[PDB]
Amino acid sequence: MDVFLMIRRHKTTIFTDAKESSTVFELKRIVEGILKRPPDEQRLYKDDQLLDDGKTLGECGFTSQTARPQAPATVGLAFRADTFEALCIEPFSSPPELPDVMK
Amino acid sequence: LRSVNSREPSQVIFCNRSPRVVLPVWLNFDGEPQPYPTLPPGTGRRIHSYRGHLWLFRDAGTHDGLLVNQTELFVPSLNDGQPIFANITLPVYTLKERCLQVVRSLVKPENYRRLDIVRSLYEDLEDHPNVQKDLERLTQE
Amino acid sequence: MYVKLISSDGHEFIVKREHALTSGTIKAMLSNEVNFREIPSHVLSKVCMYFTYKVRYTNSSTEIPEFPIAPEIALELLMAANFLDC
Ligand SMILES: Cc1cc(CC(=O)N2C[C@H](O)C[C@H]2C(=O)NCc2ccc(-c3ccccc3)cc2)on1
Numbered sequence A: 001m002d003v004f005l006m007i008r009r010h011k012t013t014i015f016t017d018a019k020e021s022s023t024v025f026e027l028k029r030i031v032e033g034i035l036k037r038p039p040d041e042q043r044l045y046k047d048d049q050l051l052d053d054g055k056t057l058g059e060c061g062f063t064s065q066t067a068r069p070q071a072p073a074t075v076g077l078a079f080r081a082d083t084f085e086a087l088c089i090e091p092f093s094s095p096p097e098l099p100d101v102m103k
Numbered sequence B: 001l002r003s004v005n006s007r008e009p010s011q012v013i014f015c016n017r018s019p020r021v022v023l024p025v026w027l028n029f030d031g032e033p034q035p036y037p038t039l040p041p042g043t044g045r046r047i048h049s050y051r052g053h054l055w056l057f058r059d060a061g062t063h064d065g066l067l068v069n070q071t072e073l074f075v076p077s078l079n080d081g082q083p084i085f086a087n088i089t090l091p092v093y094t095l096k097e098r099c100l101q102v103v104r105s106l107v108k109p110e111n112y113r114r115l116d117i118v119r120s121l122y123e124d125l126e127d128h129p130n131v132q133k134d135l136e137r138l139t140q141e
Numbered sequence C: 001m002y003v004k005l006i007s008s009d010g011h012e013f014i015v016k017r018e019h020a021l022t023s024g025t026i027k028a029m030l031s032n033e034v035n036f037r038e039i040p041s042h043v044l045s046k047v048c049m050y051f052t053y054k055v056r057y058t059n060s061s062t063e064i065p066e067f068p069i070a071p072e073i074a075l076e077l078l079m080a081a082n083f084l085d086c
Helices: A024-034 B093-104 B109-114 B119-126 B132-140 C024-029 C039-059 C071-084
Strands: A002-009 A012-019 A042-044 A073-079 B009-015 B022-027 B033-035 B044-050 B054-060 B086-091 C002-006 C012-016 C032-036
Touching: A002 C039, A012 A024, A012 C039, A024 A042, B009 B022, B033 B054, B033 B132, B054 B132, B093 B119, B093 C071, B109 B119, B119 C071, C012 C039, C024 C071, C039 C071
Parallel strands: A002 A073, A012 C012, B009 B086, C002 C032
Antiparallel strands: A002 A012, A042 A073, B009 B044, B022 B033, B022 B054, C002 C012
16 A cells, blocks of 8 residues: 655655654655755654654555645654754645635 | 437446536537436436437536546447446546636626736636537547 | 646645646646646645545546535636646
């Protein structure tokens, strides 16, 4: 099974998919390959909860029902290790008002 | 672009595998689209048709095009035993058409003019999808 | 393999090249990175979702789901979609 994700950090958002059965550590390899920075220099999260390297993305909560192509789940990414920065994700821009034309 | 009047009975199953209320449409021996009763989402219907006849399906409220067995038209084949299976599904719409669909379905068409976007988009919103249109399109092939 | 699409407000979206080559505009814009002076983040994230959706579901019998759009976003999405040609 593929799961579809947004790996997110600061103003960085990566779109990628992965097997339900691949590991949190394997996701970090993929990030490494993209953001050019080693797995030990990075932590991953769902919501606030820090993820363990040897757990699969399934075990971590990312599943078919839950991480669909058109509605990928978010994985929080954090950096630096001689001290970890705190998980921080710049929110997206807000949509305008709504035109009163909208019952 | 018409049905063949073979008079060789054919049994079909229309399954609506789509979030839309489906409108089946049989093309006449002349060529006029004939509309048939509608199918709620998920729901099925056992159908009596005939070898070599033409069908196509649409959203019944808005006439958005749908796919049957991956393609645009459906022609009941040699029936062999067992009823012929017609799977009705959303296409992957372009993101533009998709946006048109949503916007059409929220606004009254009177008020399209009052939407602040380019003018060309205003034309596109009015160019509603429709059978006669698509039959002209589909015909040229 | 990946390209970067930056939104009007700075957010950066990293996406597979072929996902991105969905859009002929982008095709031409790259050919790497591309800045979108007029597409805000809440728009360009939806766009990338549709790229991932498109690549997933095109050429599949495996019943397809509705690509959802919130009303608030519809207009901006329509405008980006028309520009990007996709
Ligand atoms: C001889 C002869 C006569 C005809 C005209 C005709 O009987 N037709 C044209 C199409 O092949 C279908 C067939 C027909 O009308 N069958 C009766 C019918 C009635 C209702 C439905 C129906 C479709 C969707 C939903 C709920 C009902 C289908 C077939 O064609 N060859």
